[PDB]
Structure formats: C-alpha cells, structure tokens
Amino acid sequence: KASVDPLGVVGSGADVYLYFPVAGNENLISRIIENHESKADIKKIVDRTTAVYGAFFARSKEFRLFGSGSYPYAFTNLIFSRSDGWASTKTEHGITYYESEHTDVSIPAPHFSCVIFGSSKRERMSKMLSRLVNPDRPQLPPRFEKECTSEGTSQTVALYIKNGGHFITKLLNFPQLNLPLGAMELYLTARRNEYLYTLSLQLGNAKINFPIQFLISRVLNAHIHVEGDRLIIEDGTISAERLASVISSL
Amino acid sequence: KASVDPLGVVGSGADVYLYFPVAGNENLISRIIENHESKADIKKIVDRTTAVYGAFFARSKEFRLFGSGSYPYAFTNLIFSRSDGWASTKTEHGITYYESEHTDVSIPAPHFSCVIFGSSKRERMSKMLSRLVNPDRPQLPPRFEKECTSEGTSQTVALYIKNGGHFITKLLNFPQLNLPLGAMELYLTARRNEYLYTLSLQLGNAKINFPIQFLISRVLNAHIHVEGDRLIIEDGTISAERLASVISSL
Numbered sequence: 054k055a056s057v058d059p060l061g062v063v064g065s066g067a068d069v070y071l072y073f074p075v076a077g078n079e080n081l082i083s084r085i086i087e088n089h090e091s092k093a094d095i096k097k098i099v100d101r102t103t104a105v106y107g108a109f110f111a112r113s114k115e116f117r118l119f120g121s122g123s124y125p126y127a128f129t130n131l132i133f134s135r136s137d138g139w140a141s142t143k144t145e146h147g148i149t150y151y152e153s154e155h156t157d158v159s160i161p162a163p164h165f166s167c168v169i170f171g172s173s174k175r176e177r178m179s180k181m182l183s184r185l186v187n188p189d190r191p192q193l194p195p196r197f198e199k200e201c202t203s204e205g206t207s208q209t210v211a212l213y214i215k216n217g218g219h220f221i222t223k224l225l226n227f228p229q230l231n232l233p234l235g236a237m238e239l240y241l242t243a244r245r246n247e248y249l250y251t252l253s254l255q256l257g258n259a260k261i262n263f264p265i266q267f268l269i270s271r272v273l274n275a276h277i278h279v280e281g282d283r284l285i286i287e288d289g290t291i292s293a294e295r296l297a298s299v300i301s302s303l
Numbered sequence: 304k305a306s307v308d309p310l311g312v313v314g315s316g317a318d319v320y321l322y323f324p325v326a327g328n329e330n331l332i333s334r335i336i337e338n339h340e341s342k343a344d345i346k347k348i349v350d351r352t353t354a355v356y357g358a359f360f361a362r363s364k365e366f367r368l369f370g371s372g373s374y375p376y377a378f379t380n381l382i383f384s385r386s387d388g389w390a391s392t393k394t395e396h397g398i399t400y401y402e403s404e405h406t407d408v409s410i411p412a413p414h415f416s417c418v419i420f421g422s423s424k425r426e427r428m429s430k431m432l433s434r435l436v437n438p439d440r441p442q443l444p445p446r447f448e449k450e451c452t453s454e455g456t457s458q459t460v461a462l463y464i465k466n467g468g469h470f471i472t473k474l475l476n477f478p479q480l481n482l483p484l485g486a487m488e489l490y491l492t493a494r495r496n497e498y499l500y501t502l503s504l505q506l507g508n509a510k511i512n513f514p515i516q517f518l519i520s521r522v523l524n525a526h527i528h529v530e531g532d533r534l535i536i537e538d539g540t541i542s543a544e545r546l547a548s549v550i551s552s553l
Contacts, residue, residue, distance in 0.1 A: 225521075
C-alpha cells in the first residue's frame with residue numbers, strides 16, 4: 054500500500070534484525086550462491102530484488118523476510134513451475150501462498166514478497182500479512198534505521214543482535230561458555246574484494262582491560278576503544294571471501 | 304684445535320644466544336640477502352658455511368659470531384680484494400685480522416671464522432681468540448644444547464633469550480611498557496615455504512588466565528598451555544616470508 058514499513062511487517066520481538074541491500078553486494082551474493090543447484094533461479098530473484106529485511110525469532114525457531122523488489126505473476130509462476138517440492142493455493146482475494154516443508158512464500162503485491170521459514174512453530178503467512186495493514190513497531194538502533202531509510206540509498210548490510218554474547222560464542226567457537234553481554238550492532242560495506250565493518254557491543258557487567266583490548270585489536274587488525282560499557286571496533290576489514298564463508302555456516 | 308666448543312668462544316654472559324645451521328635454511332637466507340649489494344659474496348660465504356653460533360651483549364652493544372665452515376686463504380683474500388672499507392693486518396703468527404668501522408673478522412684456522420661487530424666498546428678480536436685455548440662455559444637450555452651438538456645433524460634455528468620481556472615488547476611493538484618476564488626459548492624448523500616453531504617463556508610473577516591464553520592462541524594460530532610458570536607454544540607456524548621480514552628489522 055501507500056506506507057508499508059518492512060520492519061513493521063517482519064515483526065517486533067526478534068532476537069536478530071537484518072537489512073541487506075542487493076546493490077553493491079552482488080559479488081558477495083554470488084559467492085554465497087555458488088554452492089547451490091538452484092543458483093540460476095536465485096540469481097534471477099536477486100536481479101529482481103532491491104533489499105531484504107529479516108528477523109530471526111529463537112523461541113519459535115523461525116526467520117521472517119520482507120523482500121522489496123519486482124515480482125510480477127509471470128516471473129513467480131516461472132520460478133514456481135521450475136521448482137521441486139513446492140505447492141501453491143490461491144486465497145479468497147487472488148493472492149498466491151507458496152508452501153514448502155519448512156518455507157512459506159507469498160507475493161501480496163507485485164513490489165514485495167514475504168517469506169517465513171523454520172520450524173513447525175513458525176508464524177502463519179496470514180498473520181504476517183495482517184501486518185501490512187497493522188504493522189508492529191520494533192525498536193532499532195539509529196544507524197540501523199538510517200541504512201533502512203530511503204531504499205536504494207544505502208549499500209551497507211546492517212545487523213542488530215539483541216544478545217551479543219550468543220553471537221560471539223558461536224562465531225569465535227566456544228559454544229559452551231557464557232558471557233553476560235548486551236546488544237550488538239554490526240555494519241558492513243563493500244570496498245574492493247573486501248568488506249569494511251563497524252561493530253559495537255554493550256558489555257553489561259563484563260570488564261575488558263587494556264591487555265584484552267590490545268589482543269582483540271590484533272586478532273582483528275582494527276582500532277578498539279571503550280566508551281563506558283560499549284566496546285567499539287572501527288576501521289576493521291574482512292575479505293569478501295572470508296565473509297562469504299561465515300554466512301554459509303548458517 | 305682438537306676440541307673447540309663454539310659457544311665457549313662467543314663467550315658467557317650474553318643476553319641472547321643463537322644457533323643457525325645453513326642446511327635446510329638456504330631459502331630463508333636467500334630471502335634475507337635479496338636486499339643487499341654484496342649478495343653475490345654473502346651467497347659464496349653461505350656456500351662455505353655449515354653453521355653460525357652467535358651471542359649478543361647489550362651492555363657493550365656487540366654481537367660475536369663463530370662460523371664453522373671452510374675458509375681457505377685464497378677464498379677470504381678474494382672476498383677481501385672485492386670489498387670496500389676493509390683493511391687487514393697479519394699478526395705475529397701469520398693470522399689475518401680484518402677490520403672495518405664497526406666489524407672485526409679473523410680466520411684463525413681454515414675451518415672457522417670469528418666475527419665481532421657493534422659499538423666501539425665491542426670486544427677485541429685478540430680476547431675472543433684467547434677463548435680458543437681457554438673457552439668460557441655458558442649455560443644453555445637442553446634443546447639449545449641438543450641442536451648445537453654434532454654439527455650437521457640439526458636444521459633447527461635456536462634462540463635463547465635471557466630476558467623474554469624485552470623481546471616481546473620489541474616484536475609485538477609496545478616499546479614503552481614493561482613486563483616482568485623470565486627467559487625465552489625459540490626453535491624454528493623449515494617445512495615447505497614456512498617455518499614450524501616452538502616457544503617457551505618463563506612468566507616470573509606475570510599471570511596469564513584462560514581469556515589471555517585463548518586470544519594469543521588465536522593471534523598466533525597455535526596450541527597454548529601453561530606448565531606452572533612456563534608458557535609453552537607448540538604447533539605454530541610462520542611463513543618463511545613473514546619470518547624473513549622480522550629478521551631484516553635488525
């Protein structure tokens with residue numbers, strides 16, 4: 054409709070929010086989808102997608118995505134005709150719900166798609182779609198909001214993680230130890246065949262002295278300072294290759 | 304003579320001891336001497352050298368080396384004839400002392416050379432040479448002694464550093480802070496275009512918990528444990544290129 058806020062559609066209460074604009078990130082996307090049989094069809098979906106807004110819910114073990122792009126019926130029917138394990142039903146008002154074992158897809162109007170995937174406790178498509186009329190009001194950090202505004206402007210990938218601890222122990226790999234850590238923000242922008250990133254992490258009760266700061270600053274090859282209880286990492290880089298390898302683990 | 308102990312000749316009391324066998328390390332040597340005009344002559348000296356024993360003395364700002372190899376008069380005279388800034392004098396007993404601004408070289412018998420370089424307070428050649436008859440008795444760690452025994456056996460570069468702290472602050476680059484650290488041992492063995500290394504460091508009063516151990520283990524990509532007050536780093540690697548870059552800083 055007139056004013057669809059994509060974050061209002063994915064829903065409030067998520068453990069992780071994602072903003073992923075396609076422009077400027079094609080080569081990263083390419084790296085991620087070199088490892089799938091459906092790479093020809095995904096590529097075509099990417100060519101028709103401007104940005105993806107995502108939310109992960111740990112409690113119901115689900116991901117909800119809102120895709121802003123161009124998805125005319127001829128195109129989606131073409132992709133659908135070429136897919137294994139997908140079924141479709143037309144609702145009361147002519148909208149097609151595509152259903153898979155763990156995935157639901159609808160195209161409620163030609164400029165957007167709503168995707169829900171995960172466990173059997175994932176949200177009903179119909180409930181997500183009601184948020185087109187009555188959107189949720191999630192609370193997002195200022196730079197996350199900035200990247201999401203005026204779709205087409207930003208080429209920065211943005212992540213907001215409610216619990217930074219969980220995310221540190223999975224990535225760095227000590228999936229047993231517990232860290233009392235607050236919210237994490239992460240922003241990634243392409244530059245050559247690498248990504249510039251900025252990270253901020255609320256420390257809570259956890260204390261990080263100069264010895265620890267210095268070592269992380271070497272493990273990451275980036276500038277570190279602590280503003281109160283907020284750890285900030287600026288001017289760091291990661292290879293598009295390295296970055297591609299990390300996302301594929303999920 | 305019959306029993307010349309090269310470590311007895313470089314002298315006791317040094318801050319750093321080095322054992323550097325040429326065989327198995329030619330490609331590293333090559334990397335180090337790509338950056339000198341005299342590279343043709345050094346290469347020829349290397350082709351005639353089996354091992355180098357070295358000692359650095361901080362107080363007198365000097366390095367003393369004993370080179371085991373083959374240095375017949377025709378060869379040394381050839382190198383000498385081709386050099387700028389070198390002078391020579393034949394002593395009472397026919398031995399040639401080569402003298403430079405900061406460097407003294409003698410070949411007391413055809414299978415070894417003694418080299419002294421550094422400040423104006425560096426040792427007189429004549430005093431070093433007296434240790435061919437009356438050697439010093441330096442105390443060296445067991446694996447250092449092992450590498451030095453039966454010249455030709457080992458291809459491992461060995462370092463014994465009396466004060467590990469000094470060495471950590473120069474390399475890792477925080478040349479202002481002080482660490483109360485004991486002795487360091489370091490052993491390097493070639494393997495492909497990289498070097499396998501083992502390091503042990505006496506900690507003294509310094510304390511290193513699991514958070515610190517883990518991070519260093521990532522900064523170095525190696526296995527770390529602490530046996531009492533001794534930090535041990537095993538199975539670590541460094542590129543022959545990286546290693547070459549570090550030595551050239553001196």
